[PDB]
């Protein structure tokens, strides 16, 4: 790979520079290079990996949604025929998005998840796996199998997190938030989504008297997003 000649520590240093410069494509490339050195990632390094690809795919998702919206209106009654360009360009963005998801999933499978034994790394990577199958599901039309893959990854992450992490652990909370969104937006299970978000919120509240000052802002933010969703859903 193009990063094969760069020191691991240099890749990490440049990923942090790319983050400061909001150069997320570069950041992802540097972190892919770091993963491919074959050593496990630290907590800080996992965060760099996730933020890089989250921002890359986030921009692709936002663009895909803009184009898909334009495409669907072009297929409403009364809409003037305009040729294949909207579909073509939506497909172009879609294919690029799928390629990024496939790249992330390949890294997780080679071999981050295999070597992750600690709960904090294993749940983190399985959550990522669920997240990127979910992003694939958003554009899939095939779709059932992708949805099943997302659910299986989220479920294994959930089982570990509940056995090995306190309720206010930010990774546990962020997994529950995203799995509840999966239920609501992807899997047509709004009641499961609401139940998961509420149980997660309530149990985190009762655990707050143990939560570290370190993690307070992360976990409070995610708790507020759980609350925001519940307000939106109920």
């Amino acid at each position: 790979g193009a990063m094969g000649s760069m020191e691991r520590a240099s890749l990490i240093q440049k990923a942090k520079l790319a983050e400061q410069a909001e150069r997320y494509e570069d950041m992802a490339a540097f972190m892919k290079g770091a993963v491919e050195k074959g050593e496990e990632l630290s907590c800080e390094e996992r965060n760099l990996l996730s933020v890089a690809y989250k921002n890359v795919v986030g921009g692709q998702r936002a663009a895909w949604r803009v184009l898909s919206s334009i495409e669907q209106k072009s297929n409403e009654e009364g809409s003037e025929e305009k040729g294949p360009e909207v579909r073509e360009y939506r497909e172009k963005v879609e294919t690029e998005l799928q390629g990024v998801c496939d790249t992330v999933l390949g890294l997780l499978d080679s071999h981050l998840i295999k070597e992750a034994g600690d709960a904090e790394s294993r749940v983190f990577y399985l959550k990522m796996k669920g997240d990127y199958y979910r992003y694939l599901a958003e554009v899939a039309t095939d779709k059932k199998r992708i949805i099943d893959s997302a659910r299986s990854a989220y479920q294994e992450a959930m089982d570990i997190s509940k056995k090995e992490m306190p309720p206010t652990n930010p990774i546990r909370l962020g997994l529950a938030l995203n799995f509840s969104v999966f239920h609501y937006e992807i899997a047509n299970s709004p009641e499961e989504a609401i139940s998961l978000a509420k149980t997660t919120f309530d149990e985190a509240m009762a655990d707050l008297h143990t939560l570290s000052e370190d993690s307070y802002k992360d976990s409070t933010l995610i708790m507020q997003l759980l609350r925001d969703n519940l307000t939106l859903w109920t």
């Binding site: 938030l177 969104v181 933010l221 995610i222 859903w233």
Partner: peptide, 5 residues
């Protein structure tokens, strides 16, 4: 519905 932004 929101995930972390």
């Amino acid at each position: 519905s929101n995930t972390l932004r």
